[PDB]
Amino acid sequence: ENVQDLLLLDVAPLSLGLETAGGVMTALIKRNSTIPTKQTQIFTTYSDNQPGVLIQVYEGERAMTKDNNLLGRFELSGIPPAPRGVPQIEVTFDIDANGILNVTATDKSTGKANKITITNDKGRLSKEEIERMVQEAEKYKAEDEVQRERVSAKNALESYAFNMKSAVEDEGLKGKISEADKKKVLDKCQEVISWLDANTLAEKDEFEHKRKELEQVCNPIISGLYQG
Amino acid sequence: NRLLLTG
């Protein structure tokens, strides 16, 4: 009933996903997942007032999209002007029984959507090519994880700076934070942002050190809002 | 967490 399906259901020979900020391969369907299947994940915008998102569909097991196979691209436009992290974009990867992939992106504000259809692996890749991709991925796992963690740390630092700035500029925190503390926060945030813009190829420990620097300024101030 | 998409 449920174990006899293990032999009857076909599987996805390669992980399928899309490019997220930093050139990261974000998989929505993992290699060896049974098909037909549907996986959904919600994403947001990278920059302030971003008018749309570029959905870049990749296949492969490596951490960075440049080291995987590009399947296609489409844009979802019409996003209302909003700060980074505000719009919610629902992305769905759907594989039918014939291995055909439909990738859909939907704006949660309007339900506005766009999509792309991609043929199965059998008509694009040889078993040799697929196995090769898997092999190469296994061979370079540690390196790939280093890269992934690097980008993760960068995104975390940038998001933290933007969120701190947003927090202290929010009208809700007017009078909760002193103007002086607000100035401390904003100054440190601007310094961190300049650093980020000037150091695109920085490593994990550098990003982390910088985030800790920002935290040294911000944490006692935010913590003070919640004191007994 | 929310992951980010460029335009």
Author numbering:
A (entry chain A): 386 to 613
B (entry chain C): 1 to 7
Study authors write:
The stress inducible human protein HSP70 (also called HSPA1A/A1B, HSP70-1 and HSP72) is of particular interest because it is considered a cancer-critical survival protein.
Here we present the 2 Å crystal structure of the stress inducible human HSP70 (residues 386–616) bound to a hepta-peptide model substrate, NRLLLTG, used in previous DnaK protein structural analyses. The X-ray crystal structure of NRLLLTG-bound HSP70-SBD reveals two molecules of the complex per asymmetric unit cell. Molecule A (MolA) can be traced from Asn387 to Gly613, while Molecule B (MolB) can only be traced from Asp395 to Gly613 and contains a gap in the electron density map corresponding to residues 506–509 in the loop Lα,β region. This N-terminal region of the HSP70 SBD, which represents the interdomain linker between the NBD and SBD, forms a short helix on MolA (referred to here as αN) but is disordered in MolB.
